[PDB]
Design a protein around this nucleic acid. Structure first.
Lengths: 446, 446
DNA sequence: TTTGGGG
DNA sequence: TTTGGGG
């Protein structure tokens, strides 16, 4: 078996071609006629892909794929944009100005789906994987020459989705423009809530960039992968005219609810911008980030400490945002949280000597964790070192000699408790400085 | 390394012992004192386990385990009751009348968590696994002699949870009795809704057997595994006295939200009994099961067709309940849905001959799928064969010659469309009969 | 695999 | 591993 890249496939329906590609869109498998099923997809690869960060996408920068079968069960069900598909025996032809690969599974063509995500669903562990999780033939195995192809496409897919939006603005309609649509349309939104209306009827509360909120019923039997907080792209939805209270989206037998691979820049972006207008301390965010960082995407501790100098994005920037819960604060002695600092030697020192140099700072360490790291036994440190102003206002308390000022000390002691004993978490912006992440432009709201 | 079963471990804190066990309860890791962290667990194994189906549990039928460490990161975070833990160098002593295993991770003891679930979270694929997903040492590998131990304990765990409730009534308080509790208490309920109140603040709408509804905020960073429709056991929750509109549960730094392994009988049971009182066709249930089957647990197509004659429960019973969506209905010709039947020869025949024997029946086949099977390419058939009454009323239409009665035919033709083109699903009770599942006591409500 | 392909 | 263990 020899594979060719999408942009290099020969233009013919005479010689069977094979390839590995990244899926960016897919309908659910559906009956188009009697004894004739179809699954339509949009695919990209290193030789053919979308490069815009925003706005319309160039239709000549991605290719399509139409899979044909005579039974529903022979077609693939694709949940995640960013996953990989391997097709054996496909033809290529031009349709509506695009490279359109075709493949009759009912003849001798086959397909196989490979997971592109490195970590698990909860983002908690590493799942690194040379075998398809879903495939058309009984031939559930891969060849040697394929290994490198799959491994490289995965790496590329992740790098690609983390660098580009991939899904362009013409591939969806803002919800505020939905009621006005003639027929069906696509949606890119964040799932704000999942409500079980019946054992397998999950009502999804959707919200997109336009700030409009819609609801839709998703069949749990088909889409057991959707969960609260995730961003999805709905392929084909129509507006329910008979919706009076809630604005409702209706899905069809060919509609698909597509998630994005974890590295997706578009998803990270949307998870950050979209919030739900809603309405004894437990599991609440304890901080407030300067508004100037409002639309800044969050980075997991996993990416922050293990891929920092390993990405064509992270190694470039110095300011990040992340969320975590504090497992411990050091120094243990809160009185030592505020120290004396010498500008000339950049040396800190206890204030238990009663010095009065005035220049006091904070030098606190937070041992933290988040979902991407809590299952491992590493320690991750985030610093609150203010000799240069970064994080100066975190505690909403001036850096005074805590050996003398008893109130400031107790105030800080409460904060320590607050940061570690109520399932609460920190949302902070940090700046890399000499191999350390220092908190900045972030302050407690408690 | 030699391992001993829980009930056979020597009663001493002198010789270090090692074991593999099934976790049925665990607190989140927490700081109990300065430089001293703890994780408390309840464990069982083939030699020591709970056998009641309902009511109080015998405290001498399970053992406890207390893990000690000097830092948070050295203790395990356990999400799923039913998962397996391997402990190296543990001591055993009697405490409050129970076998209590102890282990100092800060000394030389270690732990390792092994997934007991055969299929993935979505229940969509097979994840069968000889390596821990979480562990205390850098020694992330298992030995040869261990392989059999782990494989056997897994098999046992699943068989155990599918046969017993495991979690007894004394291990939780019904929500209708919660407000009256003195201090903290435990909860076993179904998650009816997950609502994102903040990037990492997920509000859970809980409902238990007592029919009372409570809400609680779960920190997504700690519990990224909870999802709508699943049953959980909350270890340590207190009632929020300051809750006026919603009845709220408050969790602490040591509280844990525990799910159950898929085979859990208790979970299957609760997912079936608990519904939420809520308030253009899409993703709705199309049928109604006779009320006499109201508290009957559902069985996935996966279990129905691949483990049917492979379980110490399924091979015993003949009547099941399951949910699925129809991908195709056969015969293709709806007119052939109703045939003539000869009682003596048990032979069916087309009615296109205009025979008037009166005895007409339905002999329809539904090619179906559900989350446990949609990703595979097998076909699963459920029958609606009424020669013996089973399923006689499914269609709410008498079995008439569809070659003559044009209205009955069209009525059935609409049903075919309804069963296959609106993301809707069937909830039906079936009886195994000669290697086939025939629908019974189920009828369309559309 | 000249089907249907945004159904 | 005589800690603390339902915290």
């Amino acid at each position: 078996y020899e594979y060719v890249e999408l942009a290099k496939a020969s233009l013919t329906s005479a010689q069977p071609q094979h390839f590995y590609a990244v899926v960016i869109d897919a309908t659910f498998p559906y009956k188009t006629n009697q004894e004739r099923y179809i699954c339509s997809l949009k695919i990209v690869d290193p030789t053919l892909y979308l490069k815009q960060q925003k706005g319309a996408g160039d239709a000549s920068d991605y290719a399509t794929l139409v899979l044909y079968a005579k039974r529903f069960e022979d077609l693939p069900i694709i949940h995640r944009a960013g996953d990989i598909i391997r097709v054996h025996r496909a033809t290529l032809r031009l349709y509506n100005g695009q490279r359109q690969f075709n493949a009759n599974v009912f003849y001798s063509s086959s397909w196989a789906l490979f997971s592109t995500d490195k970590r698990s669903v909860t983002q908690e562990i590493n799942n690194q994987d040379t075998t398809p999780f879903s495939f058309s033939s009984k031939h559930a195995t891969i060849e040697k020459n394929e290994i490198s192809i799959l491994q490289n496409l995965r790496k590329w897919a992740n790098q690609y989705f983390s660098s580009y939006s991939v899904i362009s603005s013409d591939m969806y309609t803002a919800l505020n423009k939905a009621q006005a649509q003639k027929g069906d349309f696509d949606v890119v939104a964040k799932i704000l809530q999942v409500h079980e209306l019946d054992e397998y009827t999950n009502e999804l509360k959707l919200k997109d960039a336009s700030g409009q909120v819609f609801y839709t019923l998703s069949l749990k039997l088909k889409f057991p992968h959707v969960r609260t907080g995730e961003v999805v792209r709905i392929r084909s939805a129509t507006y329910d005219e008979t919706s009076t209270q809630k604005k409702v989206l209706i899905l069809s037998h060919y509609s698909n609810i597509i998630t994005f691979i974890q590295s997706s820049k578009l998803a990270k972006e949307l998870r950050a911008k979209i919030q739900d207008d809603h309405s004894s301390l437990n599991a609440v965010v304890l901080t407030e980030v300067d508004k100037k960082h409002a639309a800044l995407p969050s980075t997991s501790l996993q990416d922050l400490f293990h891929h920092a100098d390993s990405d064509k994005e992270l190694q470039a920037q110095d300011t990040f945002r992340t969320q975590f819960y504090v497992t411990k604060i050091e120094p243990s002695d809160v009185k030592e949280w505020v120290k004396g600092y010498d500008r000339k030697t950049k040396k800190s020192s206890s204030l238990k000597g009663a010095s009065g140099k005035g220049d006091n700072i904070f030098q606190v360490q937070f041992l933290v964790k988040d979902a991407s790291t809590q299952l491992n036994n590493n320690t991750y440190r985030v610093l609150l070192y203010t000799q240069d102003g970064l994080g100066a206002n975190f505690f909403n308390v001036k850096a005074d000699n805590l050996h003398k000022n008893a109130d400031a000390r107790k105030k800080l002691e409460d904060s320590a408790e607050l940061l570690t004993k109520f399932n609460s978490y920190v949302d902070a912006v940090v700046e890399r400085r000499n191999g350390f992440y220092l908190i900045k432009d972030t302050k407690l709201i408690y």
